[PDB]
Amino acid sequence: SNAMFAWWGRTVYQFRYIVIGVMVALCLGGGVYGISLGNHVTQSGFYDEGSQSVAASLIGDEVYGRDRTSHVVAILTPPDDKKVTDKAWQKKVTEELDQVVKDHEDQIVGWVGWLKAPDTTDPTVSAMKTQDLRHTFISIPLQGDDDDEILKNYQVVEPELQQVNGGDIRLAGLNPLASELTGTIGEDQKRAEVAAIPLVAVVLFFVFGTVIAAALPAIIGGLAIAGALGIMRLVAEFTPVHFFAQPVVTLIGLGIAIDYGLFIVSRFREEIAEGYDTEAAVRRTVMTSGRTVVFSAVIIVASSVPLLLFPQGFLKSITYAIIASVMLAAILSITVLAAALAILGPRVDALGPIAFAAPILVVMVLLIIPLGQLSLGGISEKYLPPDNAVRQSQEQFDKLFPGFRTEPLTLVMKREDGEPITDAQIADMRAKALTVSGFTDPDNDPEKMWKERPANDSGSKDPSVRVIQNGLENRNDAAKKIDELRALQPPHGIEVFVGGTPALEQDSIHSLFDKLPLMALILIVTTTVLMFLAFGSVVLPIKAALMSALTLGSTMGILTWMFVDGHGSGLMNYTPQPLMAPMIGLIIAVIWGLSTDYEVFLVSRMVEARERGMSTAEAIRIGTATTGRLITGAALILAVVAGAFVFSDLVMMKYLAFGLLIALLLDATIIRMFLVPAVMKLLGDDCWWAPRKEFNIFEMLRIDEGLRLKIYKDTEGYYTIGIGHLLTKSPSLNAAKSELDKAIGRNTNGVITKDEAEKLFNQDVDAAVRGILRNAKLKPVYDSLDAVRRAALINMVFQMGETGVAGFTNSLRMLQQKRWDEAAVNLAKSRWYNQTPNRAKRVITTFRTGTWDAYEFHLGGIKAFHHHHHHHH
């Protein structure tokens, strides 16, 4: 979990050109493929595919024919205050309808209404005119055998349909609504493009203050959107992908991808500032923030995968879109972006107590409970704003022609014997149905209840299956009534499925509450276990768990307060109503994933700040201080993009956009600035509790002068051993062993162990220090600098002796005055740099940054061994 990133940090620099070359190609390549996604999405996926109501629907459609009476209904109004019985007006509007049908029989079944045969004596067909005879409504059924294909047929037809009767015609019903709701997806996209993008740019340019560093996270976000669209278009080949998946790509793209790059470009900028070369800088960015971004991605994946337990194809498409977008953004941010930073380098900056935890926990259990007012429902026309025209057409359809809009509950019966269902068997099942109270009798007659479902040409008309249906008299009674009709023991040899839109809707709701317990368990445990792996603590996952658990109930609290009870509904032009039931599942996961993502970008920095070597109090203030500006900048970029989506006409889109605004504002202030810094010193030293090598001068000179466990001849021809330790200049090898035996204290016959070399090396060091402390030109600088920077100066004394490095009077002076950059530049102009660059560049870098990094990740190995000065004996 800590060396692969060092592995990848090195190689993304070596092959930086092909890396930026291939994945930009594929993302753009995915972009051209993915643009077609909108023509391969579905509106279906809100019900439970394994439910008995879905079985009841499936069987009922197959046998009786899909119900198409609610597809399109159109209200007609004669102009100039003529009345619909005007035979001239009648003649002109029907021949217009007849012409629309003949032009579009591949999409229109036909049109039916009182306007056909206006001399009829039918009570219901005469109920298609109003009493003042100034409005009449026709029903216009259409071709197709899934929702999607039928909607694409309505949109071909309605331009030519809206113009009948000189435009004085209002279109309502299933397909007009579905068209308006699915049409909000496209409008919310263009509002993101227009408002969020420039706003995001401004926030970036304020966080970085320079064009190049600001433009990079924007280009990453663009590439992730292009790549994720290509992936989801590919997923479309194999399984239906809901409409709602496309806005999810845009969100994560403009939001998380851009925020991922903000964290990385910011970390590259700091490492440049601390004196690291750019290829050093790229490696340590990947090893820290790249690891943080990667583990952020897997956390979010760990939070969205649990939604795959729910059956709705709607939640599955969304889950796939989160997964694809999020890690494409992680992968993009440590490939395309890192390679870019490796190419440019510094030119990214080229252009222009209990006193606060208590009165806050009080107000967040304050908000958790407005829940319990939470109610759930299906799609109605109320998902649109009240001034929306087609919603108004529906609401006046149901005012002028009441009683045609129905949601009958269905008892689909089938006998797998295969032979017909006799009249006594349905009279049987009918009798069992009148058992249950709560159903409608416009006839005051039980004998006229539970009529057969109507049947049309699309139906197979198999005799071994019959459907009877009857509307409900109060739909809030539906869940229990449905359970009651299923409790009926069927006749002998028949299976009875309970159908109807209230059965589909209710069965969907029952599946969520049935799998919601386990979903909550998987989610919080895997996120918990994950954070234990990211830090090594066992309380910092548990501190994050109950904070996240609390910002969840509070945000759900406000949302119910706003969308069930309506506080803000008049302001923001939405109707208060029960929530789309699978929206609760989606909202829970994404908000949980957001709360725990905040607790990694802040705490993983102070986990880093403390493992370096510090106590608590400061580690948290370092962590909070260095991340303070970045997390707000990241917070505002999310808040900007989400703020565009709160103005969506579709009320489930507003619900979700608001959930994130309330959630990311609550954590970017109340939690991050106040509550957990409080609890982070409150329980202050066991933050890092869990039940389950430092570099040094030995290891650095081992790299620069080698480590040899048996006598060898150096470049000059002299017998050497260990770390550059000269034994003798005698040609006799026996004289070298005689001296090696003397130095170690035993018969070596030319070989020592590692610890023996270490004991020999230390003696050489001690002699080098004694010399340094006895030179007027080296001792003052030597005293000036720290343990690491002293090792670099001892290295020089080893390679060239005291007189040698004492000749660097300027650079030693600059080092004494802590002017590291000036000394690094001056020393690199020496002759010692050009003769032994790999070691001089390595040593100078240690003066610049004051750490071992040039030695912990070094190039190749050395091939020319040379005994150092200050060989002790």
Annotated binding site for SQ109: 597
Choose between 227 and 255: whose C-beta lies nearer to ligand AY6: 255
Q: Does 174 bind ligand L6T (CB under 6 A)?
A: yes
Among 10, 40, 66, 841, binds ligand L6T (CB under 6 A): 66
Applying the rule CB under 6 A, the residues between 433 and 472 that interact with ligand L6T are 454
Cβ–Cβ < 8 Å for 534, 690: no
Q: Can residue 151 be called a binding residue for ligand AY6 (CB under 6 A)?
A: no
Figure out which of the listed residues 91, 347, 405, 448 binds ligand L6T, where binding follows CB under 6 A: 405
d(CA 422, CA 433): 17
Tokens coding 192: 């993101």
- Give burial (CB, 10 Å; 0-12/13-18/19+) of 209: exposed
- Checking phi first, is residue 80 left (phi over 0); if not, alpha (psi -120 to 50) or beta? left
Residue-wise burial string across 421-435, b where 16 or more C-beta atoms lie within 10 A, e elsewhere: beeebbebbbebbee
Burial class (CB in 10 A: 0-12, 13-18, 19+), 159: exposed
For residues 66 and 432, which CB has a smaller minimum distance to ligand L6T in the complex?
A: 66
What is the residue-wise DSSP string for 124-160?
TTGGGB-TTSS-EEEE--B--SSHHHHHHHHHHHHHH
Residue from 48, 158, 705, 764 carrying the catalytic annotation: 705
Nearest residue (CB) to ligand L6T, 310 versus 798:
310
* Residues 195 and 639: beta-carbon distance below 8 Å: no
Residues 93-132 that bind ligand L6T (CB under 6 A): 112, 116-117, 124-125
Q: Does 182 bind ligand L6T (CB under 6 A)?
A: yes
From ligand L6T, ligand AY6, ligand MHA, none, interface partner of 173 (C-beta below 5 to 8 A by class):
ligand L6T
Nearer to ligand L6T, 367 or 653 (CB): 653
> Between 35 and 64, how does the x/- string for binding to ligand L6T read (CB under 6 A)?
x-xx----x---x------x--xx-xx---
* Number of Cβ atoms within 10 Å of the Cβ of 734: 9
Q: Is 714 a catalytic residue?
A: yes
Residue 838 interacting entry, from ligand MHA, ligand L6T, ligand AY6, none, C-beta within 5 to 8 Å by type = ligand MHA
Contact 141, 112 (CB under 8 A): yes
What backbone torsions phi and psi does residue 130 show, to the nearest 5 degrees?
Answer: -85, 170
Nearest CA to 791 out of 852, 741, 832 is that of 852
State the virtual CA torsion across 788, 790, 793, 794 in degrees, nearest 10. Answer: -100
Other CB atoms within a 10 A radius of the CB of residue 757 amount to 20
Number of residues that bind ligand AY6 (CB under 6 A): 21
Supply the minimum distance, in Å, between the C-beta of residue 816 and ligand MHA: 11
| CA 775 – CA 797 distance, rounded (Å) | 12
Residue 720, interface with ligand MHA (CB under 6 A)?
no
Site for ligand AY6 in 287-306 (CB under 6 A): 296, 300
Residue 132: Cβ within 10 Å count: 10
Distant-in-sequence, close-in-space partners of 431: CB < 8 Å, separation ≥ 6: none
Shorter beta-carbon distance to ligand L6T: residue 245 or 671: 245
CA dihedral 528, 529, 533, 536 (to 10 degrees): 70
Which helix or strand (DSSP H or E) is residue 854 part of? helix 853-856
> Does 227 contact ligand L6T by CB under 6 A?
no
Q: Name residues contacting ligand AY6, limited to 103-122 (CB under 6 A).
A: none
Cα 315 versus chain centre, distance: 14
Which amino acids are annotated as binding site, given as ranges?
Answer: 43-47, 597
Stretch that binds ligand AY6, among 152-160, 359-367, 637-645, 750-758 (CB under 6 A): 637-645
Per the annotation, the verdict on 381 as an active-site residue is no
List the one residue out of 172, 175, 125, 139 whose CA is nearest residue 155: 175
Minimum CB–partner distance for residue 74 and ligand L6T (Å): 10
608-614: long-range contacts at Cβ-Cβ below 8 A with a sequence spacing of 24 or more? Answer: 608/288, 610/688
CA pair distance 221, 357, nearest whole angstrom:
36
For the segment 246-285, give every residue that binds ligand AY6 (CB under 6 A). Answer: 248, 251-252, 255-256, 259
Residue type, 172: A
171/660 with CB nearer ligand AY6: 660
Site string for ligand AY6, 164-203 (x = CB under 6 A): ----------------------------------------
* Site membership for ligand L6T, residue 222 (CB under 6 A): yes
Whichever of 225 and 778 has its CB closer to ligand L6T, that residue is: 225
Say how far apart CA 827 and CA 805 lie, in whole Å: 11
Is 575 a binding residue for ligand L6T by CB under 6 A? The answer is no
Distance CA 460, CA 432 (A): 27
- Judged by CB, which is closer to ligand L6T: 255, or 706? 255
CB of 816 to ligand L6T, least distance (A): 48
Which of 208/798 has CB closer to ligand MHA?
798
Residue number with CB closer to ligand AY6 (251 or 805): 251
Judged by CB under 6 A, the chain residues 813 through 832 that form the site for ligand MHA are 826-827, 830
Q: Which stretch binds ligand L6T (CB under 6 A): 82-90, 188-196, 305-313, 726-734?
A: 188-196
Residue 542 beta carbon to ligand MHA: minimum distance, rounded to whole angstroms? 50
CB of 839 to ligand MHA, least distance (A): 3
Interacting partner of 638 out of ligand AY6, ligand MHA, ligand L6T, none (Cβ under 5 to 8 A depending on kind)? ligand AY6
* Residue ranges in 23-62 that form contacts with ligand AY6 under rule CB under 6 A: none
With CB under 6 A as the contact rule, the residue among 594, 619, 620, 676 that binds ligand AY6 is: 594
Lookup result for tokens 């658990």:
549
Angstrom CA distances, 692 to 208, 568, 685, stand at 40, 51, 17
Helix (H, G, I), strand (E, B) or coil at 721: strand
139 binds ligand L6T (CB under 6 A): yes
The count of chain residues that interact with ligand MHA, using the rule CB under 6 A, is 18
What is the DSSP pairing of strand 579-580 with strand 376-377?
parallel
Please say which residue, 69 or 762, places its beta carbon nearer to ligand L6T.
69
Other residues' Cβ atoms within 10 Å of the Cβ of residue 102: 9
Q: Does 810 bind ligand MHA (CB under 6 A)?
A: yes
- The one-letter code for the residue type at 530 is L
> Minimal distance in Å, beta carbon 8 to ligand AY6?
21
Which of these is catalytic: 714, 739, 756, 764?
A: 714
Whole-angstrom distance, CA of residue 579 vs CA of residue 377: 6
User: Concatenated DSSP letters for 77-105?
Assistant: --STT--TT-HHHHHHHHHHHHHHHHTTT
Residue 322 binds which of ligand MHA, ligand AY6, ligand L6T, none (CB < 5-8 A, kind-dependent): ligand AY6
Rounded to whole angstroms, the Cα distance separating 85 from 613 reads 91
Within 487-516, the residues that bind ligand L6T by CB under 6 A are none
Query: Could you say which of 188, 597, 705, 764 contacts ligand AY6 (CB under 6 A)?
Result: 597
In the complex, the residues that contact ligand AY6 under the rule CB under 6 A are: 248, 251-252, 255-256, 259, 296, 300, 322, 590, 593-594, 597-598, 601, 634, 638, 641-642, 660, 664
In the complex, the residues that contact ligand MHA under the rule CB under 6 A are: 704, 799, 807-811, 826-827, 830, 836-839, 862-864, 866
In the complex, the residues that contact ligand L6T under the rule CB under 6 A are: 35, 37-38, 43, 47, 54, 57-58, 60-61, 66-67, 69-70, 73, 112, 116-117, 124-125, 139, 146-147, 173-174, 177-178, 181-182, 186, 189-190, 193, 197, 200, 218, 221-222, 225, 229, 243-244, 246, 249-250, 254, 379, 394, 404-405, 454
Positions annotated as catalytic residues are 705, 714
